[PDB]
From TrEMBL, chains A, B, C, D:
Places the protein is found: Membrane
UniProt-recorded name of the protein: Potassium channel protein
Full-protein residues shown: 21 to 110 of 114
GO cellular component term of the entry, any: membrane
A molecular function GO annotation: potassium channel activity
Organism, scientific name: Bacillus cereus (strain ATCC 14579 / DSM 31 / CCUG 7414 / JCM 2152 / NBRC 15305 / NCIMB 9373 / NCTC 2599 / NRRL B-3711)
Length: 93, 93, 93, 93
């Protein structure tokens, strides 16, 4: 539970970081910068807001390598430590 | 077997949810909304039907975080608990 | 070793299936159809050759769910049962 | 630690390989070729720099299958063997 909370906070900070970076360097609206950060770190990669600057491209490379680990860690704990038990409880006859 | 069935039903409900959301908010044809939901939760992300509204972008963020866990759980069980044994049976000399 | 071989053959058949489907239904050159099949099942999803027909979209949904399991199984075995040992052997002082 | 170092070097070599290939065959600026290599092997796949030549498409197929294993291995070790302990240390009361 404390584990999920740390991961939750780490994910938030990471996304705020991306939001600030892309709005500044790539000139994205903050909402689009947040959207892009999430779509990037979850490896979805629609591509609509991909970086046009070299600074943006270099940050994105580093952001992916550092961010993917904690975003999927959070997703994994959410799925295993939260969603799993809930669905089960909704089964209990 | 009951596990695969629950996951199958959970995946269906999740996809119906996306289908309804994107057809409503993003104005997609239902088939395109379903297609987009799948392409999103499997992390493929072609990008053709990416959300243009802020409401769409925010939902997509939440949808990804909540949906990826159960979609890949289903894929994983399908692969391990279903495809694996079948291919093996097709080997049995 | 026999495991890697089965997975290798299963991956090939799956890709041939996609190649045939997309060249037929989506009118892709065979090379582009193969490329699209791989880019889809590995979840990269550049998006250049995404399906424009409903038949194409529906197949793609099913193809993703059935194909991702065996493509990543193959990738995983390749990495663990093949690449891992080789790199190690190149270390042995 | 030696494991992380090998993976770090293997990831670098792999990315240099992609960088050289795409700048040569697809005529990308080196920075864009590196960016594309990373976006490919991490399965993000924005799609802006996708290959237009058959040679590019064929290499990309092989590059994905061979590269994804080591890139995610590196990401996994980075997350487990490096990020995990650090965040923990920042907790120690
Ligand atoms: K993509
Ligand atoms: K992707
Ligand atoms: K992906
Ligand atoms: K894309």
């Amino acid at each position: 539970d404390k584990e999920f909370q740390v991961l939750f906070v780490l994910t938030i900070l990471t996304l705020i970081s991306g939001t600030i970076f892309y709005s500044t360097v790539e000139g994205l609206r903050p909402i689009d910068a947040l959207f892009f950060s999430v779509v990037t770190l979850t490896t979805v990669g629609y591509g609509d807001f991909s970086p046009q600057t070299d600074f943006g491209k270099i940050f994105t490379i580093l952001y992916i390598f550092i961010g993917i680990g904690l975003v999927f860690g959070f997703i994994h704990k959410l799925a295993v430590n939260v969603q799993l038990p809930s669905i089960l409880s909704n089964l209990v006859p």
